Nucleic acid binder design. Structure first.
Lengths: 112, 104
DNA sequence: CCCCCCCCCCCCCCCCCCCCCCC
């Protein structure tokens, strides 16, 4: 598991309540989507120049349930995970790719 | 950056020479594809886009199997393809408080 | 080490974009 580092650290708020589901053979998989905003004002004072980014975080086991029990819409949380892009096929049988921050082995989540 | 933190840190090797391009006013956009793997060997590919100065250096000194350290943000952009189907794509972008660095 | 995954950021002086499958 050497050959480099895959690390993403996030601090942000949930868009909606955690969407927990069960994976085959003992579920415990919680999908949360969080926002991080950023600001600036490049071409002349625009009184604002916000820009929200949405991240798709996925927790497993213990943490999946913790989020399930204590994370609600607004919760602010700290996340440390790895990026993983998964390929899946859609209705029309076309190839799709989804990138996520999965909180696994050396991961971690924590309410703020 | 009101609201939280959005940051990704990668250390891996380019799977292919830097594909450098020059967008409109201000040509400087390099795209690289970084590989990071793990034994226990499952690898993951990353799309990192460098801009400006970082862009030129990537073009200048980075080559295929090169190992780099990257500090950036996570961005996912949507674009409809020649089919009328909405697509999304997330990449690590090295902008503001980000950095790139040649290792070894 | 890269075999490729993916079209492709716009902070931090002093909301919530929402589009997103099931490691």
């Amino acid at each position: 598991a050497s050959r480099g580092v895959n690390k993403v650290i996030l601090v942000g708020n949930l868009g909606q309540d955690p969407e927990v589901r069960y994976m085959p053979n003992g579920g415990a998989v919680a999908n949360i989507t969080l926002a991080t905003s950023e600001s600036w004002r490049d071409k002349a004072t625009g009184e604002m120049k916000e820009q929200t980014e949405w991240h798709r975080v996925v927790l497993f086991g213990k943490l999946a349930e913790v989020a399930s029990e204590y994370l609600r819409k607004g919760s602010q949380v700290y996340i440390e995970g790895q990026l993983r892009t998964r390929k899946w096929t859609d209705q029309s049988g076309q190839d799709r790719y989804t990138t996520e921050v999965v909180v696994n082995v050396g991961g971690t989540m924590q309410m703020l």
